[PDB]
Amino acid sequence: DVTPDDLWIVMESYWQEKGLVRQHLDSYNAFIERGLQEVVNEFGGIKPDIPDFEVKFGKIRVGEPEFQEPHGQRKPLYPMDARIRNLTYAAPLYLEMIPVIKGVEQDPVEVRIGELPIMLKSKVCRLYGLSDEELIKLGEDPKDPGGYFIINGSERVIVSIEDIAPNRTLVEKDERQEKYIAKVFSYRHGYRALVAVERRKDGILYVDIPNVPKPVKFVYVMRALGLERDKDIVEAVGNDPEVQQIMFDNLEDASDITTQQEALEFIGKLVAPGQAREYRLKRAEYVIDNNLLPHMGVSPEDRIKKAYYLGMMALKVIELSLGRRPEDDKDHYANKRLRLAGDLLKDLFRVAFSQLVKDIQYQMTKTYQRKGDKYTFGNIHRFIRNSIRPDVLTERIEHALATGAWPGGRTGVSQLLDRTNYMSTLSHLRRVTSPLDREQPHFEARDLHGTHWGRICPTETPEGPNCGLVKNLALMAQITTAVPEEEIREYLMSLGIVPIEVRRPDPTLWRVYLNGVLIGTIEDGKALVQRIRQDRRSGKISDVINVAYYEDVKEVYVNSDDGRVRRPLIIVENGVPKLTKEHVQAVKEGRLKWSDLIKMGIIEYLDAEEEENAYVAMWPWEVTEEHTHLELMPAAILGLPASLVPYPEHNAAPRNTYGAGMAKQSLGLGWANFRIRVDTRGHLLHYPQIPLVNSRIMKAVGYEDRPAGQNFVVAVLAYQGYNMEDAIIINKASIERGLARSTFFRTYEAEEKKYLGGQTDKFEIPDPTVRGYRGEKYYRNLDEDGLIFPESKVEGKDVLVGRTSPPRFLERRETSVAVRPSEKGVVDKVIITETGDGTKLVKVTVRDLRIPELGDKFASRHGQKGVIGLIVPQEDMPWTESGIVPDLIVNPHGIPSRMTVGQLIEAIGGKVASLKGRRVDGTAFIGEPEEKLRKELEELGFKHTGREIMYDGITGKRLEADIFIGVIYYQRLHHMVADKIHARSRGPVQVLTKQPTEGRAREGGLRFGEMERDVLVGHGAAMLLIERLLEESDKTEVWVCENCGHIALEDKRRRRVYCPVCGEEERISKVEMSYAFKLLLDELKAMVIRPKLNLSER
Amino acid sequence: KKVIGSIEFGILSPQEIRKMSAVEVTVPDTYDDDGYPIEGGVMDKRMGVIDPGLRCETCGGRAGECPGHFGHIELARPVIHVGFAKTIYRILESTCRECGRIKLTDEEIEEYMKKIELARNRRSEFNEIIKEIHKKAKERMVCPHCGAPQYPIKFEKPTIYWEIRKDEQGNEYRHRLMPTEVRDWLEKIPDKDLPLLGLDPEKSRPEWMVLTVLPVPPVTARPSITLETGIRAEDDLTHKLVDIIRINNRLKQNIEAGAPQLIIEDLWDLLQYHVTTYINNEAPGVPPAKHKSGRPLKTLAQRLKGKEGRFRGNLSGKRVNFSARTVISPDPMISINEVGVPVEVAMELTVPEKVTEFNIERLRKMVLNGPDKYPGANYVIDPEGRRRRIMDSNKETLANQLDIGWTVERHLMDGDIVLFNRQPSLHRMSIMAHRVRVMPYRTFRLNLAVCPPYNADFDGDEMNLHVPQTEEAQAEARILMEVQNHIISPRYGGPIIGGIQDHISGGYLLTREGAYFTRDEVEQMLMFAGVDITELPEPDKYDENGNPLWSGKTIFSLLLPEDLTVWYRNKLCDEPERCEALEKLIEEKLMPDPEEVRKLAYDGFVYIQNGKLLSGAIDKKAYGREDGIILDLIVREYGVERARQFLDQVTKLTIWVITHKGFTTGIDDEDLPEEARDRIREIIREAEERVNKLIEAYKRGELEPLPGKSLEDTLESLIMAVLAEARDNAGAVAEKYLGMDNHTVIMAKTGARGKILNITQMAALLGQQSIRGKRLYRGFRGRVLSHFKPGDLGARAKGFVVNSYKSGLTPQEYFFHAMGGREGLVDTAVRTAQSGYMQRRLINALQDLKVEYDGTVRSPEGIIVQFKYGEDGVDPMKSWRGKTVDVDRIIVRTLLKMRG
DNA sequence: GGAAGTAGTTACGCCTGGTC
DNA sequence: AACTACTTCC
RNA sequence: GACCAGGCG
Ligand SMILES: [Mg+2]
Ligand SMILES: [Zn+2]
Ligand SMILES: [Zn+2]
Ligand SMILES: [Zn+2]
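# zinc ion complex -> structure
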């Protein structure tokens, strides 16, 4: 048979042909190729208030990425210049207009309707299809995978959203009123409708419509949708005798009250309360056509199909009532479809295009009315061109991408791309999020599902509120892109399916559902499914098609939608997998590609629905005749940061989660482009190293070309109690030789802002006569131009861009840019450039050398976080009989409570790899077994247990016990103690509350919250509570009139204190209270409440 | 100077608002084009000034010094206060329409007045009585005092009062009650009728609820900041006031000019909506007032309520000066009551020290050093209150002019008292006072024994450091909050500050059987621990080379009180017969011959006699997070300084032992022989066969349900019981075979770190995984993964992991373990949120309860909650593990003291 | 007594950046 | 959302 | 200044 080492070649070919960001690129390419034109086709031509004029819409075209200079013209624009000059990497969008004058169409005019931002490495970007040298010449890292946008100079990545499958009805139990609830999320043109039917405890059927304030009896809706005959309704809902009786009982009390014509009026009463009968009818039919089952259509011709779909939903809820079917799981991945960059862009562009269409209509009507018809019909091209106003669409789209607040309630869709290292960027580009609120305890939604196998990483998920709700894709996951539904419908109908109009469903007849909607009926549904999959394997049917059946309820589901997470499997027939040794050799020699293997029907893509019908084997030697598929590589079920962990199955799951999460925070050469890149913060490990024990997936992906971490010599012993409690002891000599050394980059930005009236600011060294002038020492490194020379040492509070702004005090004010108060470094790079509007812009990059010290956080790939508790000289470190000195010491007390046997196995493997001169394979399930590693260590001349005889450095005698020592790949995280230490004696305060400001960046004060107040009270410390909460935040003195209790007024001009409310001058005394309480008294004296104060003598 | 004795809350009268105001605002504008405030606008200088360079017209003070002053807006037509809407509705439907009386009988009036005078102390009884009066008045149709129909009043969401009258014969109409007629109705209410409605005759008036004059909050209460772009960013209150002024001006114009009543009513409703959203934007049933951007505005109600509101965000808890935060790192070489402070923080934070007779020289030296050198000062304050920053060309003069009575803000130095806090702050030990010890590097240092109170674990933890500034606060901290105290937890009356992992493991390596140490090791460990000693005790053994050797028990006894005597069984007791023999020997006379005890010495029975350890090994029972017998006795019988000294010495000693003796954990720590592996394999095989038999019996209907649950639940419970028992048996085999010489076993049996479950999961099967107490079921239909046949209920197919961590997990078992870990990690956050909310509720309910000088516990109004705290008068912190007094311990201690 | 409505809460800090 | 508790129509 | 997102214990 085929070894798993031979299936590894096929998996590597899969990752070679298709990158790691193929979901974003595929979705965006589909959006550009067809999505924009689809949206424009939904948006019919603009019809203004003109007697005989209206414009049709032609073909959407997107040009090359170009930028319109403020005083020049459209130069070509490349992503580096877009992300350096704080531009948006967009392209002109052109739309043809067909003017219809009195029913006839003239020649088209092409007008630019706005700019569309371009995702990097897509089919329209300038980086597409460029060799490594060409990308390098453009100042780009060839390792960068694209898939993100550049908006106003910042890199924005759109995170996929794990929504519920549209147009699919799910049944479940309310468990409160004993009412069975079946809801569907019908989608049409970006609008979702929550249509639900309800069987209450009384046995009557109710339907909920989002815009109908109250539920309506189901038979009323069924008759309003064109079903005049009662018997027709009973037949359409179901033919089973029990269901027939239920529908008869539900319909008798409906027909005795509301007939066909009465139902629309009854709905209208609730929809449009009042006496306007025609308006009630109009509103009822509007909410029927638009707000009930919009996916079926909005025309009255689609009302009948709405009735059939509602009858099917009612039949499902009845079957749930009878218990013939189980509850529909909402976490089952057959019921969830991802929303990608393509569809989210489609919806956002739809909203922006609606705004532009309405604006152009307004402009056309206004211009026509306010200059008549002299040139509107004399030259229609100028009339159309001047009415365009294209900035609306581009501003809307760019604002949505930059802020992340999508149209509707969606928020956080677009997030700032993480560029800490390779792993963080790729994992962010492979991330999935859930729309549920993170505060609530979604126990069923935060847990791992069996359908996540091969689709979602089981171990990589953040800790805290987002646990389980933020997911990352497995390495084998593939997300579909929709195929045209009409061709699929036609092919399925040709296969033998007869539409429900001709043949009605029966218990002995299979119900076929395409894309979640019922299409027809067939006998022997298993034969139909077999024919479908045989056709797909033969190649005549596209890859995206997936089909499954259910013997329990006799239903065949056909899926061809977009956003389905799938995994590849090897087709097994009659106990023999389709993949053979010659296929593997052809793949290895480059004669065969992954797409070829998919097209020949050797490897199959299955989502959860089709996988339900599968019986998958995990190893080639486990295949029997009953198996339907074989696992290509079980180690690919993990995510990318989770695949960084070696021997992950020898660790506890929480520690694997910790390691996967901490792999995205390590320091290393994340991108070779870092030197010329302008970014707010960045790190650079000076000597990155390949993990000696590493998975083959890490080499296949490309992590080896951008490593983040180093291999340390680690001894597991307790040393002077300074590695106690997860602390770490490190070697001073190793640090001084370059171990874990790094540099921190910060890029300050200063813009020469152009205010109104020509009042500009100036880059210059300000004279001391300007207002807000800092010390003359702070401008020491500045040049006469106003910019700091590069490679000049800069410490805290020193300025980099001397700048003065026009006066606005009630001489020129100063607004120069200086380094942050707690940050030092050397000026690595000073660039000067021009903004989008044309003002001068300067970026200054400061690099600070961060040698490891006490408090810096270190982590291993197995989840063992820790900070440096001590830095010990080499002569104080213990040494081995072989001359090996540890670079790091970890307390043994952290091993057993955490149960990370994988770390010990990795230490053994690292020692063996170093001794052999060959790196050790640490793949998830096919890596080198621990027994082989121990035997090899024994044969190399060392103890098989990994324990070695060690000597104490301080006293010189050998330790009593044999010390476990090895090589473990430790990574330095960006949580440095220099970036976290903060101390505030006294500084700025907020204007509103006079309390200290918030934040390390603005000399903030630490919040002494109410929990600490209760802690202080429980100690009995009353004066300490006064000192901490009154003297040190907002202590003030107020004048109170003893006669009235209001706040007295002190006239500094007249040198008098009095109460305006009563005019008292003798009964006035000071009180001492926090300024926040005086503000509270002010807000209480607002909204008309009198807080009279009574004073006591003390 | 005065202090606030009480606060009386009332409703401001229109005359009060008119007199208290400094301006009447008419212009709905903020600033002019040049940048100066518009006279008559919301930012008029007669309401205070916030922009630097301006001057106040009411105070004459500059920005930040003028407190702020109120203004009023004379509303053209009165509006209804949203806060008092339901109160106005209740009063309207409980009082007469024409005369205004409460519509209650005079006998009922006098009886309810008498019942109001009584039962006023508690709010609940008064509220219930008010509801009863409201119901009785609401039901009534005719006013008893004057014959008049009382049409019922309907109330929709805010400020919509709608009473229903019979317009025609048999036809009724609802008439909307405008604020004018509502207010007039309220003025007609007499003063003798207010108490039965709950209103105060003087501090409140029902008519004042309908507000005709709106106070404008001062400028300082709604500041506006100028953005770096040059544009002005106003507050939400400023915008809402501008809109209110604009609409009020429109209404006044339409009223004086003359308009159709419908337009006037529409403008009136617009003004009412503006005022209602100004007072409470999230009031029920009102469209929130949205900002131009699209977000809703934050108004007075949002200013007050909420976690980010005024009360919780700026009154109960607020940001403070003289605080610091950085990562914490371990430091076993500082005392338990000390903290290592970085030089940067010590130089930044200062302690105000008034110069006196004795500290004049030191303050002169530190003024000479200045803000640069660490033992220096930052500021010098003369007695007049004028402060001067120390700098070059100032140090010599300020040092010369130090005199006496001046204030010098000096740097932190050794011995200073500070507050140290890791702030998830659950109990009162989350903040304790530590003595400052200045350290070179930039991280906080903490002794290991003080970790359990803070729950700190040196994995990136950060702790806040607060420096008390007044001498009263410093004394309070140093007397009540120091780390020497709080060794015993108030929760359970047991030691919370004790050895954690390395102290326990090193103590076991020290005191265990056969553990001996050389002369150099003994001297070095005694010097390292800080134990004072000038002569070593006589050695216990002699090496084969004649070298003297000391037992670990002698070294441990060198740091015990010479009077201490106690015996107990620790966790290392595996053969109870030896412990019973030792107890039988002790019980005969209570002073057994030391050599006789040494003959029967056992590691599982600790027996200290006159401060000499004669049997037993140091365990978690000696000192630990809970049940530290020796530490508890030392802290209860010898004081709290002796406990601190013993804790420091024993921690350093055990650390030295574990460091220089070698303590490691390797792969071999999870190894089992072939016999143990075979026994475990047979255990799992028999468990799987039993589960198969149960499944087959359930499939044939052979099994019958257990009481209280169905057949399916019976089968599930039986399967889980079998699997748990199999895991227990495999763990028992592993425990039997691994032995006590394994370091992983050593730290688990001694309680230093890890349980038996960890060793079982690491050296034997992992056991059954479960979510919410059930077997793994979430996945496909009839199965969990698609690698198992649907409908399978077997052990492996439902989450029973048959592999150890050492043996490596199969992919199915890996996914099952991932599910278990996920359920645990999900549980943690939900539990912490629920616990935090419950703790907040408990604290807000029990905050003020305290013990009076007579021994009782009383509520703030004087209500006695407990006539004796804890029903016996003993503080749980001072109690003996919840007991009033340890009678047997006292008896044995006294008998040994006298008869000894 | 329902049977809906309505309102009120849902741990504590801290850090970073980005846009208004 | 998911809990409670009132309130309040029935 | 408040909003969002991501992290840390
Ligand atoms: Mg921690
Ligand atoms: Zn007064
Ligand atoms: Zn003033
Ligand atoms: Zn009356």
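# post-check
The longest strand of chain A covers residues 90-101.
Residues 436-437, 439-442 of chain A lie near DNA strand D (CB under 10 Å from a C1').
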